[PDB]
Write an enzyme that holds these catalytic residues in place. Structure first.
Site, PDB file in Angstrom:
ATOM      1  N   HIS A  41      -2.269 -16.753 -13.928  1.00 47.89           N
ATOM      2  CA  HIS A  41      -1.557 -15.593 -13.516  1.00 47.89           C
ATOM      3  C   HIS A  41      -0.172 -15.918 -12.902  1.00 47.89           C
ATOM      4  O   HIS A  41       0.912 -15.023 -12.707  1.00 47.89           O
ATOM      5  CB  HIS A  41      -2.490 -14.825 -12.610  1.00 47.89           C
ATOM      6  N   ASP A  86      -8.613 -18.093 -14.524  1.00 45.25           N
ATOM      7  CA  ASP A  86      -7.201 -18.444 -13.776  1.00 45.25           C
ATOM      8  C   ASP A  86      -6.922 -19.967 -13.960  1.00 45.25           C
ATOM      9  O   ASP A  86      -7.106 -20.475 -12.721  1.00 45.25           O
ATOM     10  CB  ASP A  86      -7.195 -17.950 -12.587  1.00 45.25           C
ATOM     11  N   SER A 180      -1.197 -19.333  -4.518  1.00 45.50           N
ATOM     12  CA  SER A 180      -1.852 -19.482  -6.013  1.00 45.50           C
ATOM     13  C   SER A 180      -1.556 -20.681  -6.759  1.00 45.50           C
ATOM     14  O   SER A 180      -0.335 -21.160  -6.594  1.00 45.50           O
ATOM     15  CB  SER A 180      -1.311 -18.201  -6.770  1.00 45.50           C
ATOM     16  N   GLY A 181      -2.301 -21.200  -7.506  1.00 46.78           N
ATOM     17  CA  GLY A 181      -2.195 -22.470  -8.143  1.00 46.78           C
ATOM     18  C   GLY A 181      -2.287 -23.760  -7.554  1.00 46.78           C
ATOM     19  O   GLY A 181      -2.479 -24.902  -8.169  1.00 46.78           O
TER      20      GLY A 181
HETATM   21  C1  LIG Z   1      -0.908 -15.648  -7.705  1.00 47.51           C
HETATM   22  C2  LIG Z   1      -1.090 -15.833  -6.385  1.00 47.51           C
HETATM   23  O1  LIG Z   1      -0.058 -15.915  -5.586  1.00 47.51           O
HETATM   24  C3  LIG Z   1      -2.469 -14.537  -5.578  1.00 47.51           C
HETATM   25  C4  LIG Z   1      -3.251 -15.440  -4.549  1.00 47.51           C
HETATM   26  C5  LIG Z   1      -3.755 -14.390  -3.522  1.00 47.51           C
HETATM   27  C6  LIG Z   1      -4.752 -15.020  -2.611  1.00 47.51           C
HETATM   28  N1  LIG Z   1      -5.533 -14.112  -1.631  1.00 47.51           N
HETATM   29  C7  LIG Z   1      -6.490 -14.430  -0.974  1.00 47.51           C
HETATM   30  N2  LIG Z   1      -6.811 -13.191   0.020  1.00 47.51           N
HETATM   31  N3  LIG Z   1      -6.973 -15.746  -0.595  1.00 47.51           N
HETATM   32  N4  LIG Z   1      -3.425 -13.847  -6.451  1.00 47.51           N
HETATM   33  C8  LIG Z   1      -2.880 -12.475  -6.771  1.00 47.51           C
HETATM   34  O2  LIG Z   1      -2.070 -12.263  -6.535  1.00 47.51           O
HETATM   35  C9  LIG Z   1      -4.349 -11.732  -7.620  1.00 47.51           C
HETATM   36  N5  LIG Z   1      -4.760 -10.653  -6.883  1.00 47.51           N
HETATM   37  C10 LIG Z   1      -5.915 -10.069  -7.470  1.00 47.51           C
HETATM   38  O3  LIG Z   1      -6.463 -10.540  -8.548  1.00 47.51           O
HETATM   39  C11 LIG Z   1      -6.659  -9.099  -6.870  1.00 47.51           C
HETATM   40  N6  LIG Z   1      -7.883  -8.691  -7.607  1.00 47.51           N
HETATM   41  C12 LIG Z   1      -7.197  -9.647  -5.406  1.00 47.51           C
HETATM   42  C13 LIG Z   1      -6.100  -9.826  -4.366  1.00 47.51           C
HETATM   43  C14 LIG Z   1      -5.688 -10.915  -3.796  1.00 47.51           C
HETATM   44  O4  LIG Z   1      -5.700 -11.984  -4.735  1.00 47.51           O
HETATM   45  O5  LIG Z   1      -5.348 -11.351  -2.562  1.00 47.51           O
END
Ligand SMILES: *C[C@@](*)(O)[C@H](CCCNC(N)=[NH2+])NC(=O)CNC(=O)[C@@H](N)CCC(=O)O
Ligand SMILES: *C[C@@](*)(O)[C@H](CCCNC(N)=[NH2+])NC(=O)CNC(=O)[C@@H](N)CCC(=O)O
Lengths: 234, 234
Positions: A41, A86, A180-181
């Protein structure tokens, strides 16, 4: 990273920064001198990878920059679900060599047991609701939880089995937006890739879900050895 | 730089960038693999130097970062005058090797003549009034004018003889704020250091005042060779 502290300048020698003209995008993991693992992503049309970074204001005299020469995703990944499988492999345009603040992370031989203590790290949100980001990466320890905790915490959707459920049961520590990542490391081994979680992060009863690197070992090695038709675990 | 265009990515390999935690500070010039020449008014307690930079958004893969190991100013410099003897020599903590976007500039053997066409370059303002800054350095050709034009134009302070008066008579081309410390190159020869001018840059009849490198040749060579007592021309 919510609930952590500034990482030690030498404890994150494998953490890569993905960025572009629009700024910071995500983190990544250097596994050998030519490849980087990150989340699918985090992909963008164009971007570059920065190695050996600690402070963004006060630079390290040994940082390196490279452009992604090749990018690989699972052939069987769901088009609409952004966090399905992912994982993304990035073949660098030029090899990166070890230095004081750069070094690769080894792939796992076996998976982590429920309850193991692991390290999360990144330059993502430190305050659950505010758009305040660090200058140095933050580090925090979290535990490997039973996968059912996540399956039930996020019942409205399907939490794949090729993922690790980690965090703190009562919240207070968790990865957040822009983390992320990045790698989830348990006992010095590369075990997971920060993928997704709750809204906001760090809420009690809502752990984070990480791509389970181990389940993708065959894929990773196949792609790296040269076979690009390698399909991932469903 | 006011009145030019973006520099070609290969025509400014000696251009250094001095910055710190508060951001960008000034431009500079690599004269050999261990020393950088810049303006004395660009000093700051802490700062770093970046080599091989063009675009601040899309980075080059051969950029280098070093720290100021030693700084040198004219012993006989005026305390309260920010631009008196505006030159500073910096000894790098570690040598910088040539690469696609990094190469030193040679010291002059003779001073430029009046009427010579010279190149100016930097990341300073591109529009005199607006606090808008370039992403890539802007270059422009100005002419060496009769030192007297500066002398009369700035009759409200005194213009030293150890400086070059350069610009365009009717205005429309000049260096601006944050362009200081960068080089004035005439026929590939390093001839001056951006120091000061009028408010705002580009006004007709008010040229740029650059520190005349040739006049400091001896001090420069004495300093680099080891004589830390070398005095500057009055
Ligand atoms: C791409 C990356 O920066 C994020 C990481 C979020 C991590 N959140 C937590 N609480 N550890 N991921 C997203 O933006 C993708 N979000 C989703 O797929 C949603 N269904 C869930 C929301 C979320 O990730 O917090
Ligand atoms: C420090 C350096 O970035 C600037 C460069 C200004 C160049 N200006 C023009 N028109 N070419 N230098 C200063 O800010 C120092 N300024 C002064 O000493 C003032 N006496 C003049 C203000 C001015 O330079 O415009």
């Amino acid at each position: 990273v919510f609930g952590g502290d500034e990482c030690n300048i030498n404890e994150h020698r494998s953490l890569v920064v993905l960025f572009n003209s629009n700024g910071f995008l995500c983190g990544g993991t250097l596994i050998n001198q030519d490849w980087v693992v990150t989340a699918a992503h985090c992909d963008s049309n164009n971007f570059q990878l920065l190695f050996g970074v600690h402070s963004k204001k006060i630079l390290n005299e040994d940082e390196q920059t490279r452009d992604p020469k090749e990018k690989f995703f699972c052939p069987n990944r769901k088009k609409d679900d952004e966090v399905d499988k992912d994982i993304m492999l990035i073949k660098l345009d030029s090899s990166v060599s070890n230095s004081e603040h750069i070094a690769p992370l080894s792939l796992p031989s076996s998976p982590p047991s429920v309850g193991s203590v692991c390290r999360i790290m990144g330059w993502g949100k430190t305050i659950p609701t505010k758009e305040i980001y660090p200058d140095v990466p933050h580090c925090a320890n979290i535990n490997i939880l039973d996968h059912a905790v996540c399956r039930t915490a996020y019942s409205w959707r399907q939490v794949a089995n090729t993922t690790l459920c980690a965090g703190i049961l009562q919240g207070g520590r968790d990865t957040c937006h822009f983390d992320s990542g990045g790698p989830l490391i348990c006992n010095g081994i590369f075990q997971g890739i920060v993928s997704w979680g709750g809204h906001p992060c760090g809420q009690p009863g809502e752990p984070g879900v990480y791509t389970k690197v181990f389940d993708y070992l065959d894929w990773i090695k196949s792609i790296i050895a040269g076979n690009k038709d390698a399909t991932c675990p469903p």
